[PDB]
Structure 1
Amino acid sequence: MIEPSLKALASKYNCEKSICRKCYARLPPRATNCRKRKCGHTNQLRPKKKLK
């Protein structure tokens, strides 16, 4: 089991992200555009879904 203090540190790298809707990119949560050229730097982003 992971302590809650360490679980937030790990979640900062694995979970707190946004995802490009066309090419599936792991983006910073605050990002407004995708960094990949293949999708045309689209603004169509959505948060990475969480376990529930």
Structure 2
Amino acid sequence: IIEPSLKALASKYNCDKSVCRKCYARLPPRATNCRKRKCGHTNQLRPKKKLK
């Protein structure tokens, strides 16, 4: 198993993210608009789904 502090550290980069609803880009958790041009920098973002 992973020690909880290292699990939180890894989750910071792997799980604590935003996802664009239009282009699925993995985005910073506090992003207001997607950084991708293909989606027109849309503000339609959701949190990345948490495992369990």
TM-score, normalised with respect to structure 2: 0.96
Structure 2, unpaired ranges of 5+: none
* Deviation of 1:22 (Å): 0.5
Q: How many residues align?
A: 52
TM-score, normalised with respect to structure 1: 0.96
Structure 1, unpaired ranges of 5+: none
Distance 1:6 1:51 in 2: 16
> Which whole-Å deviations, capped at 9, do the CAs of 1:4-25 have from their partners, x for residues lacking one?
0110110010000000000000
